[PDB]
Design a protein around this nucleic acid. Structure first.
Ligand SMILES: CCC[C@@H](C)[C@H]1CC[C@H]2[C@@H]3[C@H](O)C[C@@H]4C[C@H](O)CC[C@]4(C)[C@H]3C[C@H](O)[C@]12C
Ligand SMILES: [Mg+2]
Ligand SMILES: [Zn+2]
Ligand SMILES: [Zn+2]
Lengths: 49, 215, 146, 83, 146, 109, 48
DNA sequence: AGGAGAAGGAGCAGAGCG
DNA sequence: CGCTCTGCTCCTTCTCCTTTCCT
């Protein structure tokens, strides 16, 4: 039962978040060049490493 | 009722204090003893001898401080005007607008009590040079700025906004936006195109600075 | 040298698809949480929904949710007449909770409705209302209804 | 549009994973379409592996143009960026 | 008659006093009366929070709503045992509230700043979006990944 | 009021008739009742309320096992509450959720 | 350097004013924690 | 289903009138 | 002073959208 809801949730999450990229000035922006975050997480640190 | 009267007076005193500090941090001169008034002093100085409050002893005026006028040269005096009639109509609002224009203020807030009519709201944005800022009274009991969830918003001048834009090579249409008629935006009295600096603190990153623009 | 190298290394590199990375890092754990508020039996605490329905409400920004809870921080610490005196100011329709009966009375020319609001219950549940608060509430309800 | 000068460049001097993968792919394409190489081949036929060898020996003749959001850019070569 | 509030807030179901792990005695309210509770006497108004991010947005502002979103997500995904980096949730909150108001992750919210008829049609309500773009002469640029 | 007309049992009403009389009308058959010399009334008893009690919680009498918290170096947890109430697929085994009885850290296995 | 909100230089008494915060603050905190850890080791040695 | 969105009604304090 | 406009505020009816696909 929960599979369908989880899949739909993941798809719409991706639709909302799909185009956000760290830039060479370190800001997180949109496709339209709208600056949503000035530094990633207020830190600029990649959570992976 | 006696306890109902006591509760009304307590709420009125707290609202008076909130308005006092709101006018303070906006950049107008009030003093720490002026804001840190005791409840007994409030009752003895702003109430009649019958045993009721009187809103008309409280309508006061503020003036720009030296540093505030140095930073924002085009800032005039305001006029806080508490009201006694519960449901404000066009008569009281028209009288208020005439008083504002005859006293030639640059701004002036209006702390109504119970309700504001849709017709009175239509006279609020009708003055070419100046503007009025209608405020409820049930809203002002606890100031928003002192809540734990509200980061310290700071207003930027024209020079500082230009400095921010030049640093990131940005355009004002691209900064994140703060709605006009936002509880913290109207607290500071934000006009369109004003940049507000925010100091938000995260446990995973300490303190970092973000920015917004009034929209 | 070790610490400086590691810190200079850990930085989000330009070009990262951080939006999609975060979207998948939130959605992927979301596929394992049950569509139910499972909890350990034997507690019977307050009912709050904290599964994928809760994530769905937060994500959807729904104007009406189920089980909304306000956390009010008090000033004192005393069970008797320190917490109840401030709980009594945030509660629901107590007219039938303090009425203790209601009467319908007719006469030669007048038609009555009588309520005998006992004061012992108010004396127990520490409430700030005696006579005229009830009367003003009833008149406000009459304006609201008839 | 203009180019940020060599004396003042504000971008990181560490090559990124995306820059590395793009450099390797472009050089592999160039080699697979019969371009001269600059390392001792030993015994190898794959353009990808030849490009990897050239990158390890730091002999790839390409530069990277980094585009800032405003629209200016900086030029970094492969013998400058480090990993 | 016996169904009209005589004291308290006619927007709140019930309140219960809770015994905290520190020994403190605080009560948490189940309803929608936030501003009234913050204003009631006997409670600390600067320390009072609710579940509803939209409620926090109306009374406290947009930054407070962003904090509320981040905390609520961290709680809902921390009580289930899912270990997610806080920065992903930070980015989710910033995106959800980066245009001055709480815009959800639905199709109605997605008309926030996307301004892209192609990706809106790719997502949902395809024909409505394409016909609206034809009428209003929507002139999008091809920059998004979709 | 809930009273019924004798000999037709239909219903009794109070009528705004002539000469200001609130007599007990019927509307089904010719039956009348003079209220004069009044004793009529309707008594409805009402349970008032009880003094409600707190909801601290009873982590006692909850399932307990013997495991180690992930953050052992901070809090020393040798027990944990659990439930075996998550089953993804039938071929795949069950899943057990825990919470640190010491600190209160939820995780699953 | 921690310049001012308009581009000036802070006067070294207004360094932690919660209004001149910027980026590089997390980097400063990292350096401070580094120095603190080394100082912990040094103090333990001196105490022994 | 549920679940929001949106377009049309329907009663209602408001405000101006001779 | 009821009358009569102008305008909310509330409410009911009416469609959209729901998971990996697996060749
Ligand atoms: C008991 C049922 C009442 C319910 C229908 C009412 C009572 C209080 C109302 C909320 C508050 O006004 C605060 C917010 C204001 C925003 O603008 C829209 C959302 C917001 C949460 C409201 C939604 C809705 O209107 C609520 C839940
Ligand atoms: Mg299997
Ligand atoms: Zn009969
Ligand atoms: Zn533990």
């Amino acid at each position: 039962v929960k599979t369908a809801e989880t899949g739909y949730m993941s798809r719409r999450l991706m639709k909302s978040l799909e185009d956000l990229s760290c830039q060479y000035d370190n800001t997180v922006r949109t496709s339209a060049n709208g600056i949503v975050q000035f530094t990633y997480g207020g830190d600029g640190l990649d959570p992976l490493e | 009722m006696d306890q109902e009267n006591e509760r009304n007076i307590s709420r009125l005193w707290r609202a008076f204090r909130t308005v006092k500090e709101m006018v303070k941090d906006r950049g107008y001169f009030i003093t720490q003893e002026e804001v840190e008034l005791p409840l007994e002093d409030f009752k003895a100085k702003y109430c009649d001898s019958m045993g009721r409050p009187q809103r008309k002893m409280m309508s006061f005026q503020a003036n720009p401080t030296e540093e505030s006028i140095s930073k924002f040269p085009d800032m005039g005096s305001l006029w806080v005007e508490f009201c006694d009639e519960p449901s404000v109509g066009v008569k009281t609002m028209k009288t208020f607008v005439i008083h504002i224009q005859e006293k030639n203020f640059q701004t002036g807030i209006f702390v109504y009590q119970n309700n504001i009519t849709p017709s009175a709201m239509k006279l609020v944005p009708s003055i070419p040079p100046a503007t009025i800022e209608t405020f409820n009274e049930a809203a002002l009991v606890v100031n928003i700025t002192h809540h734990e969830l509200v980061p310290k918003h700071i207003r930027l001048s024209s020079d500082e906004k230009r400095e921010l834009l030049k640093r990131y090579r940005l355009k004002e249409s691209q900064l994140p936006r703060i709605q006009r008629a936002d509880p913290v935006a109207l607290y500071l009295g934000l006009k369109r195109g004003e940049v507000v600096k925010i100091i938000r603190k995260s446990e995973t990153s300490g303190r970092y600075a973000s920015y917004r623009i009034c929209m | 040298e070790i610490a400086l190298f590691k810190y200079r290394k850990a930085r989000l590199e330009p070009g990262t698809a951080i939006g999609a990375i975060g979207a998948q890092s939130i959605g992927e754990p979301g596929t394992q949480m049950t569509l139910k508020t499972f909890h350990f039996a034997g507690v019977a605490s307050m009912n709050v929904t904290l599964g994928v329905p809760r994530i769905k409400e937060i994500i959807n920004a729904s104007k009406v949710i189920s089980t909304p809870i306000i956390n009010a921080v008090l000033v004192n610490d005393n069970d008797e007449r320190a917490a109840r005196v401030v709980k009594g100011r945030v509660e629901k329709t107590l007219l039938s909770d303090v009425a203790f009966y209601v009467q319908d009375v007719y006469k030669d020319n007048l038609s009555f409705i009588q309520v005998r609001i006992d004061l012992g219950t108010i004396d127990k549940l520490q409430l700030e209302l005696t006579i005229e608060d009830i009367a003003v509430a009833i008149t406000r309800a009459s304006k609201l209804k008839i | 549009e203009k180019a940020i000068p060599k004396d003042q460049r504000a971008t990181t001097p560490y090559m990124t994973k995306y820059e590395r993968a793009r450099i390797l792919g472009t050089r592999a394409l160039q080699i697979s379409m019969n371009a001269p190489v600059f390392v001792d081949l030993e015994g190898e036929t794959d353009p990808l592996r030849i490009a990897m060898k050239e990158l390890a020996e730091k002999k790839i003749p390409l530069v990277i143009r980094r585009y800032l959001p405003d629209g200016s850019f900086e030029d970094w070569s492969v013998e400058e960026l480090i990993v | 008659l016996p169904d009209v509030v005589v004291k308290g807030l006619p927007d709140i179901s019930r309140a219960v006093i809770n015994i905290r792990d520190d020994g403190k005695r605080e009560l948490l309210v189940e309803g929608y009366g936030l501003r009234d509770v913050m204003c009631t006497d006997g409670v600390i108004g600067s320390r009072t929070t609710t579940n509803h991010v939209l409620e926090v947005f109306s009374v406290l502002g947009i930054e407070a709503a962003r904090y509320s979103i981040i905390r609520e997500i961290n709680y809902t995904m921390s009580n289930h045992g899912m270990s997610v980096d806080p920065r992903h949730i930070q980015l989710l909150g910033d995106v959800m509230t980066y245009k001055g108001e709480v815009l959800g992750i639905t199709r109605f919210g997605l008309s926030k700043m996307r301004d892209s008829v192609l990706q809106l049609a790719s997502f949902e309500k395809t024909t409505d979006h394409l016909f609206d773009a034809a009428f209003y002469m929507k002139k999008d640029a091809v920059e998004g990944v979709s | 009021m809930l009273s019924f007309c004798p000999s037709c049992n239909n219903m009794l009403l109070i009528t705004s008739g002539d000469s200001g009389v609130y007599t007990l009308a019927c509307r089904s058959c010719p039956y009348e009742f003079p209220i004069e010399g009044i004793e009529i009334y309707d008594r409805k008893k009402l349970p008032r309320k009880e003094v409600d009690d707190v909801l601290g919680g009873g982590w006692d009498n909850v399932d307990q096992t013997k495991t180690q918290c992930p953050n052992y170096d901070t809090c020393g947890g040798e027990s944990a509450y659990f439930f075996q109430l998550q089953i993804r697929s039938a071929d795949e085994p069950m899943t057990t959720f825990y919470k640190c009885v010491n600190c209160g850290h939820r995780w699953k296995e | 350097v921690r310049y001012d909100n308009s581009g000036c230089l802070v006067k070294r008494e207004d360094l932690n004013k919660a209004e001149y915060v910027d980026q590089y603050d997390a980097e400063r905190d990292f350096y401070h924690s580094l120095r603190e850890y080394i100082n912990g080791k040094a103090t333990a040695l001196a105490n022994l």
